[PDB]
Write a protein that binds this ligand. Sequence first.
Ligand SMILES: [Mg+2]
Ligand SMILES: [Zn+2]
Ligand SMILES: [Zn+2]
Ligand SMILES: [Zn+2]
Lengths: 475, 404, 49, 42, 97, 260, 46, 51, 51, 115, 67
Amino acid sequence: RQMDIIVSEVSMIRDIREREIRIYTDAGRICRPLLIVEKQKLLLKKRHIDQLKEREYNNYSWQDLVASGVVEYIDTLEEETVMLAMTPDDLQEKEVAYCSTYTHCEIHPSMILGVCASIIPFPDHNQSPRNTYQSAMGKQAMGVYITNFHVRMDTLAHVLYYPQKPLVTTRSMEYLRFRELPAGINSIVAIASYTGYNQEDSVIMNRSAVDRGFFRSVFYRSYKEQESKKGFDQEEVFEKPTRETCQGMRHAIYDKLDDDGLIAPGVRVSGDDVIIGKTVTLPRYTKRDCSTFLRTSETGIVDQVMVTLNQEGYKFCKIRVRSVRIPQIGDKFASRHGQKGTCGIQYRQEDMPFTCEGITPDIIINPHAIPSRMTIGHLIECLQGKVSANKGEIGDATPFNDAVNVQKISNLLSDYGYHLRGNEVLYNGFTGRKITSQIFIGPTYYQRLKHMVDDKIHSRARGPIQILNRQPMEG
Amino acid sequence: VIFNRQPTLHKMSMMGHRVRILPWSTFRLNLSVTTPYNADFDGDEMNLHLPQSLETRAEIQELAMVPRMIVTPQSNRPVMGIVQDTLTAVRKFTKRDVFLERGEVMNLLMFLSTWDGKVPQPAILKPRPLWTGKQIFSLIIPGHINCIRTHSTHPDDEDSGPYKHISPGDTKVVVENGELIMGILCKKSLGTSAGSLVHISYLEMGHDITRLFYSNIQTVINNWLLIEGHTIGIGDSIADSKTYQDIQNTIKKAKQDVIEVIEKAHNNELEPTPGNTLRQTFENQVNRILNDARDKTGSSAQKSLSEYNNFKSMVVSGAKGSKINISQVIAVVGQQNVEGKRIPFGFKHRTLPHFIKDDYGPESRGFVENSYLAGLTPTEFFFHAMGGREGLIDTAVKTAETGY
Amino acid sequence: IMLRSTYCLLNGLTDRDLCELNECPLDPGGYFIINGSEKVLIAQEKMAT
Amino acid sequence: DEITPDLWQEACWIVISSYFDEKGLVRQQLDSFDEFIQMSVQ
Amino acid sequence: YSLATGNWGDQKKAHQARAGVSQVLNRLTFASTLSHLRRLNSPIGRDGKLAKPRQLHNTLWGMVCPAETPEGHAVGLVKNLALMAYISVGSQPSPIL
Amino acid sequence: PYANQPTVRITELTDENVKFIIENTDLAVANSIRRVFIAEVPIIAIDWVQIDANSSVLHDEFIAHRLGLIPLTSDDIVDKLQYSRDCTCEEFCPECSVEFTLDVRCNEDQTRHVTSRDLISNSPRVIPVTSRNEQDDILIVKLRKGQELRLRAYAKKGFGKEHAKWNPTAGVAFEYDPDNALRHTVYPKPEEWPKSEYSELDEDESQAPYDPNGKPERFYYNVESCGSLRPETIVLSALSGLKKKLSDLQTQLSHEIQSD
Amino acid sequence: QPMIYICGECHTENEIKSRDPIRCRECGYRIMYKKRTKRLVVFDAR
Amino acid sequence: MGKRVDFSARTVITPDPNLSIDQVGVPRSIAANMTFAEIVTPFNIDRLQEL
Amino acid sequence: IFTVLGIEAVRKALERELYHVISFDGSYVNYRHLALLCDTMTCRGHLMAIT
Amino acid sequence: MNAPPAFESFLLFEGEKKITINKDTKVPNACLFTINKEDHTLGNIIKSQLLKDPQVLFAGYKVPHPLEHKIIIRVQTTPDYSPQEAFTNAITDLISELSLLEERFRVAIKDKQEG
Amino acid sequence: MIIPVRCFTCGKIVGNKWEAYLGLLQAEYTEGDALDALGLKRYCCRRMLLAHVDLIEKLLNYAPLEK
RNA sequence: AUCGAGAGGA
Ligand SMILES: [Mg+2]
Ligand SMILES: [Zn+2]
Ligand SMILES: [Zn+2]
Ligand SMILES: [Zn+2]
């Protein structure tokens, strides 16, 4: 604890019943930081918090906190000998003392979660499989994967037009930089049965919201190519092919290519089009077409073309093509609670149900997705988000927080002229009649997932066949 | 076309469909035919095969079409029934106090394919003409079928006392000459079970009439649910303070009884029962204290519910959920088990480093005394994650061995 | 070389300097670039020695 | 001197912030590679 | 080669080598990149149907995320670091001795 | 068997919204008027873009989509212009569209906000609403020193049924029976619900006594304008367009009865 | 015919013929980008 | 025992309350790419000539 | 059961055990399917494993 | 890939007509009006106005499929009346209502702006 | 990456309010009070301003392709 | 194109 000869990552376990003292300095030991506890008292005093508050002036950092003997890294094997306080409230003298001999305290229990589970708001109000499914699906959510995406020639990349930070957030996301590169949009979710097009894990989206850019994304796809001069026997070269010299020329037109054989940026390209005109010298004479076509049925625009030399040093070309993906029926969307579903139908703003103040939901999800799944975090997030949007906040959905429960959120929401439980009177968009049931509606953070239907739809009728067995190809 | 979903488990996983060309780029399915395919719409994909000859087309038309597939030979009962929104909404629609106006009735009759064009005489003519939901479902019901069922909330002591044939709760479904004489329809009447209205329709009427029956229930009920609406929110997960404080009193019994048992075991006041070691008897005795607690708190939460509650609405209809789900959302999540036992001592005689050694109390071994609305404590959260991981492993490991 | 490691050219650079090399300041590093492809080493569990 | 409960909920998060100001999220990768280059190769 | 393919071992022993090390970094979204950089892997073999190594052990508390795990064939074998988890880099025991 | 005799009472009229009450009409008529506010009131909006140069950090479709959503003053011009379907010209002409140019280049160090004020029109009547002679101008794109955006747009006539950019409303509040007298809603717990702004009840009373013989009358509207039209112009256009749809339907109906 | 490219480092206009190694003649940088085409691509602002 | 086949299509499934149970809603693109070989007869000569 | 009572006894008992496995979770399968499985399993005078 | 143009919902294809009238042989004095490229906006008002006619025995409408862009209106009248005549009178009454509403809204604006 | 032009829900213009919103925030308004000053009644438009992340400001830290 | 690997989806 003094940063003397023993470094911080050294584990020192005393098994008492068997008289071993096992000291470990090797690598690969997973450990975590914990607050040391005096007799029944944190060593972390207000002086440490004060110095930490001005961390940017007096260069008082974490590593001084460790050097002060206030924090300690404990490995899994040494936890067996440690008596942990979940919070300093456990250190507090009680009518019946549970332990009274604690040695360490959690900094915060929410640090048991990882990167993707630290995104979930109110994860302790969900069934745990739902938290696992979200931790999986946050990795398929679109956003801005990195700030310098304009210069990266990634094979596949999805960028959301209008990423938003969640209105209801956890205090862990401040370190995941989710606020700075968020992967979703706050959507006005109504949980309702409306026309039957959201049944069995499906959603009804607002066509008008989609027209305004709601969950619109851009898909970037990069195509490689290189002209190999491996030997005088045969050499490839980028050049606009010609019908008179090239042998394996498809019937697709090559007019979009330039002299150099490379398409130019800003050119609209449809499926089966040519972006690189490459010809290889033969042993329809003395050169055969080996051009690069678009991956079929894409219909994008050439975002940019880069030319350079590879390691060995022949020409090398990268072409990024850009395709705007507007959400549509069959695109998969998810909240942060394992509630995934495809778009069942899109209604225009006049067809959607509306509140007395003409707010239509961006998304309508079916109430039958809640009861078996027990994703109460979804409902609490919706209510907290209504409070946050009406109050001008960002809600605190950190997992284990006794200063935030459903009652106090409901009391807050009732102060803004809303039903305290997040229900509203909606009117049928088609007829304008009030719906007899008051619908639960509010802001919820939704995610657009990589799984778009246009990348999955496929059909065949007498296409190509495999060489070995003359059967249809795969994929 | 043959429409198929993988894994192709039984003969209803590949059925014949007639093609309907529609704008966007997905395969659009009816909602009753999702249960045979085990299909939902969270990104599922399905395969379409087009027979290429009149021979095979006739074969699929006469053998494999969906209406011919309504009743499965596996369990002599329908394989597809009425499903989520239509089932919740038909439960709400056939309640005794559903009265439809003239315009609403005409709007619903627009969606009956098998309608003779005759508006039925309203059940109430004065002071206002009002039709009932049973009166319109009677028009949906085909042929002249006869059926007796009981709604899921039917009390078991009602068939004995008076009011057998005039049910106070509008349970005891009676369809007679194709008219819903009485009762609230639900999973027991329109689901996949044996003797239901859909089964009896398939047996008495053909597969064509039953196809139309399915479609008509869905269209009429969905267009009525456009008026009625169905939702779920926080208000359905709340209970009154009486109920909360009953549940807390029950849990504090349960813990304080488990403490009783723990001292008896500690003082050797506890003797084994036949067929079990002392450890196993203590574990039984604690688990049966805590299951009594979980059942009692669940009962309290159930009785606290109103008939405006949407959790209850979906559980009575049988559309989705169960009473145990309501108990976990409102009352208490309960004991988390790993391999059928309480949470194991993965540390030295400890489930976590936050407990003292040799702590067999309910908290320590994975009893979640909170609801999902209350929120789990960090230890409860970890133990619940352990139990859910057990479920995920089971789901991911049974498939290979069952498929083999 | 693992990116943002001590022997990486991006080591100790400011957010200015990273942007001015066409690098994202929020990029954590921790991966290699082999043949232009970003490769990440997954920690491998093993039974202690 | 003592952090009272009313302050705890930001004392703790202040501490957590400092940790992530010092370490980050990929500290294990960078430290492993650094140790490999400084020690393991030699 | 070994960082490019992930086959961890000599190129000649391409079958005795253990693959899955050195994966292509997920750049779909920032969370996927962070998680992939904090990914741990238990080389028990996905073919194994014993649940014990896939169970969430009590000792994962504070070290590994209780929730983040693939729900397919590797459930509980591929894990993720908890946020404040730090894997020790190794040190010399001579000062201690 | 005959028409309603609806009455109107306008309770608020600003440049931003119109709050009015229609009284003695059917709920279907009221909702069709509400729907026409959103979906069948034509305005002018950019529906054709040609990017001559775009060095900005937003790709070309992003700029185009963003330009389409800028409201253009459509008050007197929208009735005069034709749909390009109906125009007997080529792709464009002044009788069916409006030209816009934008040509901005950031020369200084210091970030250039390409706003709707840089959208220069050939028609002085059809201009960006924010540019009209307070509220700032809609931000099209931020440009760094060396970046440049030069484009040529054409704005056309359409309504919200084709695309939300032709929707003139910024929210249509619609209400009826503020006190739940018709019981078209059924509150489980009527005391928990806040009162409507149009409610006429003492605070002890949660909802009005049930009216068995009532129907919906006295529908309350708050039509907020995005800026392209005035709200009263939105309502008058909506009434004309709904009517005038009905007239076209009548004409086709007469032909179809004739022909039988 | 000229097919002018831009430098990734120095952003310099420069013409390069075929069968020429790709290298900027300001600064020798190895990566070059094609200029935006001069055809007329139309966008519906939707 | 199993093999790849022609005249097959695959895509995401979506709800449709307005289809009968025996109907499947299919895209124009799948239907335009999938074909059925219909034999010509005086019964269908004219219709098939339009197609 | 086969060794002690014989092929028809084990046919009956195997029916019984499969029915117990199937119905323990409240499920139901038509008896003709269990009967056909158990007959395939015993029609040759010995216990034929499904392997 | 499969997105219909947004104009399809309201524009008419060549050779397909706005409205088609069909006997309903079910019952006497009933007709089906299939109206193309309209939606709930006109269907609801026409149906409600028809429900005002005491000589109309049935008035209903449906959008058979939201992805399709037609409505069906079924009208049954008394034997001395006609569903075509009922439909015509309903449209005429709606037009007169909307004209009156427009004039009164103009007056109400007139008054609001000046007082 | 940049403030949307319209509110996704109602279609109210919010694209001219980001700069004013930031100016009000540095003027020591609370976020709610600032949203009230800009006339965003509805929690949808308040969502639009309150949840916006101005990523374009970071994208402008990179030099363009042409000088 | 083949092979292998990996990551994912239901
Ligand atoms: Mg599924
Ligand atoms: Zn013109
Ligand atoms: Zn250069
Ligand atoms: Zn809004």
